[PDB]
Design a protein around this ligand. Structure first.
Ligand code: HEM
Ligand code: HEM
Ligand SMILES: *[C@@H]1O[C@H](CO)[C@@H](O[C@@H]2O[C@H](CO)[C@@H](O)[C@H](O)[C@H]2NC(C)=O)[C@H](O)[C@H]1NC(C)=O
Ligand SMILES: *[C@@H]1O[C@H](CO)[C@@H](O[C@@H]2O[C@H](CO)[C@@H](O)[C@H](O)[C@H]2NC(C)=O)[C@H](O)[C@H]1NC(C)=O
Ligand SMILES: COc1ccc2c(c1)c(CC(=O)O)c(C)n2C(=O)c1ccc(I)cc1
Ligand SMILES: COc1ccc2c(c1)c(CC(=O)O)c(C)n2C(=O)c1ccc(I)cc1
Ligand SMILES: *[C@@H]1O[C@H](CO)[C@@H](O)[C@H](O)[C@H]1NC(C)=O
Ligand SMILES: *[C@@H]1O[C@H](CO)[C@@H](O)[C@H](O)[C@H]1NC(C)=O
Ligand SMILES: *[C@@H]1O[C@H](CO)[C@@H](O)[C@H](O)[C@H]1NC(C)=O
Ligand SMILES: *[C@@H]1O[C@H](CO)[C@@H](O)[C@H](O)[C@H]1NC(C)=O
Lengths: 551, 551
């Protein structure tokens, strides 16, 4: 049997096969020696024997508001943050390593950008069981597993206060770097860019950007409806969109992310940003009468990438974590560090981010309470209500807890079924292995993963071994932190991929982080002071309650 | 007039335009302050007031063989080298900055890999003269300039001892990262990869690699002629090659770099590497009976990339420089440094590397002395003579000096004409500006550039200003160092682009520099001990005189 199915090599050592029955662990620079990379170095030993749990820490960061307030005002706000940045990032390899096709380093992996990368190689196709050595030869029926432990029975709202404004924000932002090529199969992405390139606004390819562009003042095309600015129609900007058969071009808004037409929340955010891009164009032209379309356009896009990275980090993250520590977005905290301004979307990351439980049972817009069947392909709700109305609405309605179990609405429960299935095609390693990869202790029993006995008992008879518990289910069934949106793993696997992905954008490099990159101090400050409220309000007649937190 | 035409901003500060008549220099992190980035910081001041000339240094490195021998044996061989690596590289920006289309940072520049990048933005299209502010409104006729100062009158052999083996090596290796898209125009490359990806062996695209591949044991296809291994025929591997009309497929060797069929030297090296790739496949399979085609193939290619980087660095560079200091290729000297494992071929670099003077007057193969007209599209010379014969020949025949003037053979003198012309389309800045970019003092007169009065006097009446002397001519007409192949600028602009380009390959990163990346200690050592002699000799029945130095 393939010795590597035993996952012999610890601490990131690489299991290389040799001969017909041998294997060797490459423990290069792992901090351990030995046949399985298990004997630590004196420093490695200390470093770990002194690492307080991710649990201990999540305690502190969510406690002592008073003590934090002070720290937040001291220089220490930078110091911590930096540490977080450096440390968190180390967990993610760069340049990237494996892909659906190669469980080894290779020029093709490194250069063929159509593949999502992956942190751990697949479960060798020649192992006894689907997960390697443990568990049953057959895995739990995805469908069943989904109805038993993920089907929302009673809506559990998120204790942190997260609202649909955040939910839709997350949905929008993620679909600019998560864009699986249905034509190529799982493992393949259409979002070459692998990051915050804002391609969900400008298009994932030149042709499409040129379609969406006004080619005047750096402006993005658009249309006026009710005296308000909205994305142009597919008639004006003949771009490919995914609207159900039967809807005319003149009723479809062209936007960049073909999929965005199937949900007002999505098309709401697409409108705020289009508005914002054209707004910045004006600020620029005023300053640089000499510039042309391209430069106004290119510089506009760099300012928005910056805005996005800031909001995404100081308001979007902040809310999620729940910490008292003022996460500061400052590309300079990294200038002294050894960091690689490069990123590549990992398949693990596309999964761990599939937070469908967030969606509510119905969508309340004032006295009006719309059903999924009334929300889903509603070409009229946005123009009808207008930005402000929806922004206030989503900002007020709570979104559901993400971790815990049985909280995904039946309407989209199929998506979770597909995710589990894809996981298997991708041949992802077991949850417990990823635990270790991200520096955590693997679970010893189902009752420790879930904080109880009922589900644990059944997961046990389904999986057989805790060491056979799959990635996604493991992520959504594990116990939440105190009054959290989710638990450990999400966070300990989530932030890494999720910070490296941001700080690793080229604009955060010393080479690009210059006022001139943004057209001068004005563009630069736009970036430096971006804010959710400013983003909405500087682009709306009135300024509604706008937050990632429910009032 | 465009204020930026005056190249106002010093020390890499960025000239941003404002209003109709203003401009601002972005001196961010330049080490200088002031409206033009001219007032240094106390440290910057010291650092430069104490920098011994590139001339002073090139003296030392080429002198004191005895003192060097010791240093070479001390730990200092690493220490220096490191310094060279770090320092040299800093001169080159990463992530990349401008391109033919954008004289500003931009997402498109950063992501559209079809463009060659450039270190200095173009000469604004709205400047008084072609070079900005100085010189004449009309530039010297390329053709004339070429016949007057570059046309080889009497063959000047290179004083360093360089032979055609080196010449062809340079030619081969460069055409894997220099591959201008004739269909797209100047500024565009077909070599996405921008570096040592060995695509001149495997193809610049998947389709073509699959054509060249045996799909057995990781082997590359091939054919036996005279009991010897040679690249397959276009009949066997239906791949696109550039052979003159009238030559049948059965007489064309398919190789990866379409252009390689027009010169035995080129097809000589293509044969040595194909041989080498298949040789390593065997070493691998033996070790890993369990592996398949892909993995043998992928791992083979990583070993060759490594071999190439080593030879290219310890034998190929060493020869050029002329230094006594043992350049050591060790990716680890950089593990402590802040380095970006990323590269992008600059247009300046495609020019500065256009060393056509190297080619001799005739090609001597034993008693036989072939003319260009007998060498150029000679489909039979390689199979006729075989690897060894040619390798001995080229290793024995000296190549001509590269710097100095009037040493390019008439047969290919057109190429220099085109280079000067392309330079102008690309709107490259003046030679003197690049001097400064790469930390050198700009020339004050033509007589200082050339080491004399005759050519200097005429270049002067042609250009008008030394500050209008173009890049390429400036590079090939400047005075050579003592008994050197070329001079300062070549070297002070050459090594940077040329080292960053190597150490910046992903395999040199801590992430990939592991024995497992190469299939174990065996592949790893193959890399670690690669050598020109081993490369040829382990792939030939007999081992001829093989060197980059003439006997
Ligand atoms: C109205 C509620 C929502 C609906 C209709 C929905 C539906 C879907 C569907 C159909 C898939 C594709 C997989 C498949 O079923 O074949 C998907 C993928 C995705 N969704 Fe949603 N989703 C919702 C909200 C969100 C939210 C709030 C997030 C959280 C950011 C999110 C994250 C994801 C991710 C990461 C993917 C993968 C993207 C890719 O594979 O390219 N979705 N969603
Ligand atoms: C038998 C002698 C040689 C011939 C026939 C030759 C010919 C050419 C020609 C035709 C061009 C293209 C530009 C044009 O004319 O439109 C070219 C480009 C090039 N050659 Fe050679 N060359 C020779 C040797 C070499 C050598 C020894 C080097 C040095 C490495 C070299 C370096 C270059 C470079 C850098 C380019 C640009 C590649 C690109 O634009 O893609 N060539 N050569
Ligand atoms: C990136 O990798 C994918 C997968 O190898 C390549 O796509 C396949 O390429 C081969 C040869 O062109 C085809 O036979 C397959 O049908 C292709 N598609 C799929 C979905 O496998 C793709 O060509 C590579 N892209 C680049 C730019 O190298
Ligand atoms: C990279 O940039 C080049 C130049 O912009 C793009 O090529 C041009 O693209 C437009 C739109 O497709 C065409 O009208 C031109 O004819 C294209 N060719 C040339 C030579 O200009 C190219 O499409 C870009 N590539 C990517 C992958 O973005
Ligand atoms: C201050 O830097 C950051 C930046 C982002 C961070 C965090 C810290 C933390 C916690 C921490 O690292 O402190 C989480 C929760 N983050 C996320 O945005 C996240 C990403 C993906 C997923 I799935 C879940 C969460
Ligand atoms: C030890 O690291 C290196 C590596 C490469 C080096 C050098 C040093 C030097 C000199 C130096 O930097 O010491 C030159 C001459 N190099 C070149 O290969 C070169 C590249 C392009 C061109 I055009 C001309 C020369
Ligand atoms: C290495 O791991 C394998 C598989 O778990 C195990 O059988 C072997 O005993 C281990 N060797 C050591 C020294 O831990
Ligand atoms: C779309 O939303 C509007 C509210 O703006 C509602 O009146 C309309 O009925 C919805 N359309 C569908 C098909 O549910
Ligand atoms: C800046 O450079 C411009 C153009 O060379 C020059 O006219 C001006 O005097 C300079 N200003 C200073 C303070 O050097
Ligand atoms: C090709 O080279 C051979 C020497 O191997 C020579 O005899 C032959 O004439 C050459 N062909 C041409 C067309 O010059």
């Amino acid at each position: 049997v393939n010795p590597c199915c035993y996952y012999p090599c610890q601490h990131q050592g690489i299991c290389v096969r040799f001969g017909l029955d041998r294997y060797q662990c490459d423990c290069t620079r792992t901090g351990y020696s030995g046949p399985n990379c298990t004997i630590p170095e004196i420093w490695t030993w200390l470093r770990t024997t002194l690492r307080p749990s991710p649990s201990f820490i999540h305690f502190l960061l969510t406690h002592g508001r008073w003590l934090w307030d002070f720290v937040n005002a001291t220089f220490i706000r930078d110091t911590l943050m930096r540490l977080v940045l450096t440390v968190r990032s180390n967990l993610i390899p760069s340049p990237p390593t494996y892909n659906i096709a190669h469980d080894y380093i290779s020029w093709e992996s490194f250069s063929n950008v159509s593949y999502y990368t992956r942190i751990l190689p697949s479960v060798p196709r020649d192992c006894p069981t689907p997960m390697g050595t443990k568990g049953k030869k057959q895995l739990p029926d995805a469908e069943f597993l989904s109805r038993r432990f993920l089907l929302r029975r009673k809506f559990i709202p998120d204790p942190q206060g997260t609202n649909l404004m955040f939910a839709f924000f997350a949905q929008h932002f993620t679909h600019q770097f998560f864009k699986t090529s249905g034509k190529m199969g799982p493992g393949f992405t259409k979002a070459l860019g692998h990051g915050v390139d804002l391609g969900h606004i400008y298009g994932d390819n030149l042709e499409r950007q040129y379609q969406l562009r006004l080619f005047k003042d750096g402006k993005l095309k658009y249309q006026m409806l009710n005296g308000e600015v909205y994305p142009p129609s597919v008639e004006e900007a003949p771009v490919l969109m995914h609207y159900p058969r039967g809807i005319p071009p003149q009723s479809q808004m062209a936007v960049g992310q073909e999929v965005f037409g199937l949900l007002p929340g999505l098309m709401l955010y697409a409108t705020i940003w289009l508005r914002e891009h054209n707004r910045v164009c004006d600020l620029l032209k005023a300053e640089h009468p000499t510039w042309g379309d391209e430069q106004l356009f290119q510089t506009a896009r760099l300012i928005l990438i910056g805005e996005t990275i800031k909001i995404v980090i100081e308001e979007y993250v902040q809310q999620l974590s729940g910490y008292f520590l003022q996460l500061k977005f400052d590309p300079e905290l990294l200038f002294g560090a050894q960091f690689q301004y490069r990123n590549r979307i990992a398949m693990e990351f596309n999964q761990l981010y599939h937070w469908h439980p967030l969606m509510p049972d119905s969508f309340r817009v004032g006295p009006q309470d719309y059903s999924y069947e009334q929300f889903l392909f509603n070409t009229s709700m946005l123009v009808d209500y207008g930005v402000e109305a929806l922004v206030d609405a989503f900002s007020r309605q709570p979104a559901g807890r993400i971790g815990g179990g049985r909280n995904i609405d039946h309407h989209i429960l199929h998506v979770a079924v597909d995710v589990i299935k894809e996981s298997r095609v991708l041949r992802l390693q077991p949850f417990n292995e990823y635990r270790k990869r991200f520096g955590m202790k693997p679970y010893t029993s189902f009752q420790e993963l879930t904080g109880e006995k009922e589900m644990a008992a059944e997961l046990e008879e389904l999986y057989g071994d805790i060491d056979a518990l799959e990635f996604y289910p493991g992520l959504l069934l594990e116990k939440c932190h105190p009054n959290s949106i989710f638990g450990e793993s999400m966070i300990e696997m989530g932030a890494p991929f999720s910070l490296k992905g941001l700080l690793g954008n080229p604009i955060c490099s010393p080479e690009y982080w210059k006022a001139s990159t943004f057209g001068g101090e004005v563009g630069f400050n736009l970036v430096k002071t971006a804010t959710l409220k400013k983003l909405v309000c500087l682009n709306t007649k009135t300024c509604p309650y706008v937050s990632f937190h429910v009032p």
